[PDB]
Point group: C2
Chain length 365, copies 2
């Protein structure tokens, strides 16, 4: 018996296929390399995963100053999203139809994006006027304008290319959490809010790799191979690289590296040199194990290019994943089956309360 449901199938899905041995990731049968090359914005990719077709892209977020100022952007969105249900009248999933849940998911999803941009901009500077946000034509451009005020158009393309690449990737802790809450018939705001807490866990995976210090130790040296060969010698693990995920190169890692190249990210050369140096140093010391570039390596390069701080990069990953969460919540609603696993008891047998340790200091009312 293996605990933690490791290796069991929980659902069948039509949302997306991470074809690992095929070397491709597909959203509703559409390769993400086609979505990025044809310049499909995150708002339209959101609708594809959720609806199964194009057309009803993510709408602009309505004006709503973020009421949460906890100092943690994750806590801000997790608590702010849960508060949307009473003010917006979000009924439980059991009591509404599919189309109502879809709009409620799209409304709350883009509001989660607004909350993140506001929490990142901070309470210690005035908000970007809505009139300037109205000048933008996409959700990504609206997010970047709401946060930076004067965002670079190249940085908007970088964020858009990242969100589509991180929109959905099969089953994981946060996706599982959102489906379990939605399986209880709870409102979509409660499901999305619970998925934020699961995403906050360090063991969740997928969050951009903390490779910025390593890229800094190279820019002050001159040779990427010398540094990565030095880090492995001193016993420190090499970030952004490890066991293969897809059969060969991760397709999401390719679209993010191509985006950093096409958009002219200043740290592209040092990132490429670190990639070829880390792959060469690791494949040499461990010819038994497969080594490829983690997509989270190129994710951090693209996000740093768009002026995203390291403490904010997990929130950036959460923003793109909202599409996959919403698609899985809607699919779980149509499934209409409560997720109720079982547990086998191995604890103490039947005993009186007096025999329990520490009963003598207990006071009965």
């Amino acid at each position: 018996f293996v605990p933690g449901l490791d290796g069991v199938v929980a659902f069948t899905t039509e949302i997306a296929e991470p074809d690992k041995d095929g070397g491709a990731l597909r959203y509703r049968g559409v390769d993400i390399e086609d979505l990025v090359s044809q310049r499909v914005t995150f708002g339209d990719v959101w609708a594809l995963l959720v609806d199964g077709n194009f057309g009803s892209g993510l709408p602009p977020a309505e004006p709503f100053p973020l009421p949460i100022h906890s100092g943690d952007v994750r806590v801000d969105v997790q608590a702010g999203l849960a508060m949307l249900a009473p003010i917006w009248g979000y009924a439980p999933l059991l009591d509404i139809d599919d189309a109502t849940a879809r709009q409620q998911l799209a409304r709350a999803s883009v509001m989660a994006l607004s909350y993140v941009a506001q929490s990142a901009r901070g309470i210690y500077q005035p908000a970007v006027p809505q009139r300037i946000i109205d000048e933008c034509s996409t959700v990504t451009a609206r997010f970047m304008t709401r946060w930076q005020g004067e965002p670079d158009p190249r940085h908007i393309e970088a964020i858009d290319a990242y969100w589509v690449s991180a929109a959905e990737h099969g089953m994981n802790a946060s996706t599982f959490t959102a489906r379990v809450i939605a399986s209880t018939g709870a409102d979509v705001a409660a499901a999305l809010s619970g998925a934020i807490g699961a995403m906050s866990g360090p063991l969740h995976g997928g969050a951009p790799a903390r490779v910025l210090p390593m890229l800094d130790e190279v820019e002050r040296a001159g040779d990427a191979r010398s540094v990565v060969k030095g880090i492995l010698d001193r016993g420190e693990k090499l970030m952004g690289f490890g066991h293969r995920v897809y059969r060969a190169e991760d397709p999401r890692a390719r679209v993010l590296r191509a985006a950093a190249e096409r958009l002219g990210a200043p740290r592209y050369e040092v990132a490429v040199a670190v990639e070829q140096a880390a792959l060469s140093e690791l494949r040499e010391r461990r010819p038994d194990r497969a080594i490829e570039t983690n997509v989270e390596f190129w994710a951090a390069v693209v996000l740093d290019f768009a002026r995203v701080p390291a403490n904010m990069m997990p929130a950036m990953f959460t923003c793109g994943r909202t599409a996959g969460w919403c698609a899985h919540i809607l699919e779980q609603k149509r499934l209409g089956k409560l997720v109720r696993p079982s547990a086998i008891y191995v604890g103490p047998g039947p005993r009186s309360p007096e025999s329990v340790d520490g009963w003598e200091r207990v006071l009965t009312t």
Copy 2:
């Protein structure tokens, strides 16, 4: 053909926390029957320690003064969002970076603040807060909760909530307990796991979610005959709230504890409630004779909480407050287990296809 949706019957974990002996018709916490804890009248703060620690000794602490920073209009939403904000203000590190004693102390501190937040959210913004000196006069955590909320609570209602919170403290791998362990399996802080578990609690399909039987109990008290009312709902092809297929082999032992609590504490709606239960079981076991039909625990959970002046909108948060014991016990057990929960999903969707072949492609603006 091996896949069953909803993970029904599959075994996710082993546990030493509690045993819902469905075959034996009894619920036990660390081996102690819930009927023994209620009859000997062990307070909820001590039952919290029993479930979390495996033994008595370190009771639940009185909550510190913390005016509710959120007022959303929903008691469940207030405690869910409020618990998540306990982490950046109290320095709650992720579960991976803290030891068992730190997680133990943090889970108890947040559990009592979840009770305080719910009491304040239920009192409302239109009422001044009860001074801490009045709350400090109480002797049990359940008494401080009723006092913080109601000011001068009926001691009979304190006993009702005390018997309800122990009866609802833990019940295995339900969706909220499962969610708390999944979030804990990611190593997130204990507040994020408790906050996520409350979201799964808010669902109407959750096991033990107090049923909306108050409209039915209002009609029986108004009409005066429980049988005809119950007879009419089934004759109209409508569902009967608080009754269905058996959970335990016979009666749910928690339903027995709550019904007995509504009796000895003089709940005004008990006589109508048992009249509804008798009429419901009689009519259901006659139309479906060969079926095992029992009273849902959600039925008497509704009567007991209403007896303690708990509105229907507060009831999910009242179950939330009692279930903090099982959540924290399972979060601590999940923390020691030290393994991420990783289910899998099989793709059965469309094969590779071009974007232009997708319906609605011409509604997409590019470049």
